Amino acid sequence: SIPNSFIIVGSGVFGLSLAYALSLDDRFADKKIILVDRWNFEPPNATGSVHNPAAANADTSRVIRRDYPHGPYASLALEAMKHWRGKFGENNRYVNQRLLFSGEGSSLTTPPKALETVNYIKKAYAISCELTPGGRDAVQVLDSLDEVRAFLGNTPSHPPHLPVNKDPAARDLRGYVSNDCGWADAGASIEWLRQEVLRLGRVECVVGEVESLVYSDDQRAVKGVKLVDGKVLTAELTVIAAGARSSHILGIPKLCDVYSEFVAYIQLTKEEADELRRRQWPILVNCHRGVFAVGPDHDNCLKFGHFSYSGIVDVLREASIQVPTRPDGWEAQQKYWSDPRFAFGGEVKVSALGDVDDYENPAAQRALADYRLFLLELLGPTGLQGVDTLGLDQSDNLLNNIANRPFTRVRKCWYNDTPALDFVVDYHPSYGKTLFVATGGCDHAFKFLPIIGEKTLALILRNRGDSAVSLPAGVEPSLEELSELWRFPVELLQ
Amino acid sequence: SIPNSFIIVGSGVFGLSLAYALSLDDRFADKKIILVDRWNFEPPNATGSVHNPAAANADTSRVIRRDYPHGPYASLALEAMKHWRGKFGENNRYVNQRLLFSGEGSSLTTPPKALETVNYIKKAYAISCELTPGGRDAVQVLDSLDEVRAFLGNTPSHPPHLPVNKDPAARDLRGYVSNDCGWADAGASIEWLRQEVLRLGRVECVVGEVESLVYSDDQRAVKGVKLVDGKVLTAELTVIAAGARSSHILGIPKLCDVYSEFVAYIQLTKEEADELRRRQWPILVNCHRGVFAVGPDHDNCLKFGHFSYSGIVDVLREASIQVPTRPDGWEAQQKYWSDPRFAFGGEVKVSALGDVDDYENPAAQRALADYRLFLLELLGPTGLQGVDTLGLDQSDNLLNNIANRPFTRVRKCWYNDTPALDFVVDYHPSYGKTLFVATGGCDHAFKFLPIIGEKTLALILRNRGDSAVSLPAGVEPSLEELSELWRFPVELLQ
Ligand SMILES: Cc1cc2nc3c(=O)[nH]c(=O)nc-3n(C[C@H](O)[C@H](O)[C@H](O)COP(=O)(O)OP(=O)(O)OC[C@H]3O[C@@H](n4cnc5c(N)ncnc54)[C@H](O)[C@@H]3O)c2cc1C
Ligand SMILES: Cc1cc2nc3c(=O)[nH]c(=O)nc-3n(C[C@H](O)[C@H](O)[C@H](O)COP(=O)(O)OP(=O)(O)OC[C@H]3O[C@@H](n4cnc5c(N)ncnc54)[C@H](O)[C@@H]3O)c2cc1C
């Protein structure tokens, strides 16, 4: 029943993980598998593989955490964590790092009240106590901004003359610590996984850019793909895993909401990065500002990322705040498809005066402002306070210099959001079982790199009519559960 | 009775203004006057004069405002304003610019309540209504941060779901506008005044650094000054007007509190500076953050200065907040005198990563943080608010880019504070009437450049025993009043 030939479009998280899974399944050793990508991962006179700097996985760090709410994504990334702690994370591809999870509102133990961004943490805190051995007694909690600042070796921001508010219903930064978190060098991870796939020798890799799907004369099936250079590749099954370009290739402007975000890096000195690492510097997440910081990484940099648009929706929802649908979203992406710069990420130009020099400069201004406020509130000498906060006797000058340091580099990365934030790993219903879609990674798919190819492979086999494939032993989510969660959205077809 | 020979040490605000006054008084055309300064204002193959980049007057802008509280400094700078609007401000040396005066607390018309930094404004607002024609009806008032932001062509920072607080006793940024304010190009001003003094031909100018005073064998009088190069200059009267170095030259570690401050400049494009000027961009003073902004200036830059240490004392006092005496202040300056970098200002080095590279790097961190917070609160897309402030449909992208732009240059400037913030323009009582001190400019002396030399000259003549000198007509402050206000502090002598 299984397919006899494959074309995988996209050597990213979904596609390259699929190629790897099929390379381990001996039932396909004789079958022809083609993995085509725009980017040449093995250019001439290069040692090993180089990752695609325009892909959404191109980053020296990606955050892997798994205290997400109970569900299928709950059990999926703890399974992935076993690989990040094993062979996938060897040679420093994975790093462990405590994570400080924070927001603004009333005390963390106090029940959720409306209109407080802490409610996103209170949900993550209540669940963290359930999974972590020891329960709520083994989970450290910081219940004020000045506790978070002290936690990093900084001074209090609160003015001296004003008295500390004992009321636990007043507004302040609230936060908890989780130790079973870390980050992976996403680039080096892809490069290693790529070298692995090449060694197993079961997969043919092709440099080329897919321009159209190809159908038969009846248009009841997909034969393969047509490249921009003329070549036409044919196989029994064609898998679209092109990241942010998938809606374009598939011709479905509503399948994903595609939009870019800017990411900032501050370079540290060897001495500074050592100082923070000795302080056990954590990954810092502040959902009230929409900013998180990771590092110091393998380049001795602190990376500052932003909550995506869909991500801020969830935070504000948990606080009983509706936000409108994203401007210029969903089908509006189609007028951009002709631009080769759309869905194309990587380094961003900087002007003489230090501005972002990019055709999407205005989109960058909000992220950069949030990053600087996040920095000053935590690492600056007075938090966000004015002159009534005295104490110029009291400061950590190393943290202050970081908080005033201009961003050293800026990069651009593209999201690929779905309505329910669920992946789409299913068959296009119009063409029987000849065209498979594996995309919609939103803003959280990289962590599942080691296991997503396997789950994707079982979905390819099951929904062909064969129910023999069931997933091993008692691993949850179930294969039947996953086929539901990543069903092809048919609303768009009719 | 008048002196027969002069030595003026310091071609700055006090000294150069004195030389100019004596150059207009015909009673001294035959008398020998010497103005010695470390810096050569007329170097070879240079056209005209160049200002001393290490002096405390070396800046492309200095703020001239005169709605200071009622008193002698009240009537003194309105007199000076007539010259800034006349010959002293010709050839663009003076610029007019509205001024937005602001702080944090309850509504501006509401009476002062304790612990609110607005109280400094409420005093300045209540007095502004007294001098300005029309009274309180002719004075524009902005009573919320979102009114100040709207006043500059920016969006509201307040979140949409939260409702506007109608209570006028809640905390917010409050501010008023004064139109009779501006700024002078301090450097070009000194250079012109210098060329004026040279043309009148009555004053001899000497390049050299004073190392010690010289006394007679009885030490009941001062003969002159000894230079580092050996030269000894003699005159009947020696005038110490060496700015921040005066305590050193005089050997009185307690006479002034000497400390540096860092100043920041963001460069604008021609189009941006034009846009703000078309918007009637004001000088912005926020005493809650201790920051003010001036420009765009003649280089198309925005300059960000900080309230001095003594200046923040006054703001917090008006709010019923005592602050301790400055660390490392007053007599502690003496261990620095041997360093040629002490009391020496000008451009500051920037590291590879963009840090301030200066032996006083830690002192800079507070000012730079305050500057960025001031910028973001007023010009950033969300003020200081987080993600609950939506409205990414709504932004002024030009203001946002400025608020994210790294500081282009940083300079250092030294203050020269007194206990009561009053100048010291009097005779050293120990040496009869042979040694005169004209220093202690604190942080507000530059504006008085056109008239301070005249007032200084009358004080030189009066306190010699001759009461004939009285100051013309009915100009206040009185000469007797000024001799009191700038009396030599004898507490230090006994
Ligand atoms: C700033 C940012 C931060 C993120 N943070 C996190 C995080 O902390 N943790 C986390 O787990 N995830 C995170 N994500 C999400 C994660 O990086 C993505 O979900 C993941 O990269 C999805 O990969 P993909 O396979 O869908 O596409 P990608 O990884 O982008 O790869 C797609 C590949 O398909 C190729 N392709 C595209 N079009 C064509 C064509 N026409 N022909 C041939 N080839 C083509 C591309 O060249 C590319 O190589 C983040 C994403 C961004 C942008
Ligand atoms: C950052 C900053 C912002 C300010 N803001 C304002 C403002 O907005 N408005 C305002 O009105 N004022 C302001 N002030 C204050 C004003 O600039 C000063 O009060 C003014 O410069 C005082 O001048 P002075 O004559 O005392 O000394 P200076 O103007 O510094 O000149 C002193 C001169 O004496 C010379 N000298 C020193 N030692 C010796 C020696 N041993 N031998 C020979 N010569 C010597 C120096 O070389 C120098 O040329 C500010 C000051 C600073 C630093």
Residue numbers in the entry:
A (entry chain A), B (entry chain A): 2 to 495
Task: Quote the study that presented this structure, word for word.
We determined the crystal structure of FsqB to a resolution of 2.6 Å. The asymmetric unit of the hexagonal crystals contained only one protein chain, but an analysis using the EBI-Pisa server indicated the existence of a dimeric assembly involving a symmetry-related molecule generated by a crystallographic 2-fold symmetry axis. In this assembly, ∼2900 Å2 of solvent-accessible surface are buried on each protomer, predicting that this dimer should also be formed and stable in solution. The FsqB protomer consists of two discontinuous domains, an FAD-binding domain (residues 1–97, 183–257, and 419–496) and a substrate-binding domain (residues 98–182 and 259–418). The FAD-binding domain exhibits a three-layer ββα-fold with the diphosphate group of FAD bound at the C-terminal edge of a mostly parallel, central β-sheet. The most prominent feature of the substrate-binding domain is a seven-stranded, mostly antiparallel β-sheet, which spans across the bound flavin. The two N-terminal strands of this sheet wrap around the dimethyl-benzene part of the isoalloxazine ring system and provide the amino acid residue Cys-414, which is covalently bound to the 8α-methyl group of the FAD cofactor. The substrate-binding domain is also responsible for dimer formation. The central portion of the interface between the two protomers is formed by a long α-helix situated on top of the seven-stranded β-sheet as well as by surrounding loop regions. The active site of FsqB is located at the interface between the FAD binding and the substrate-binding domain at the core of the protein and is connected to the solvent by a long and rather broad tunnel.
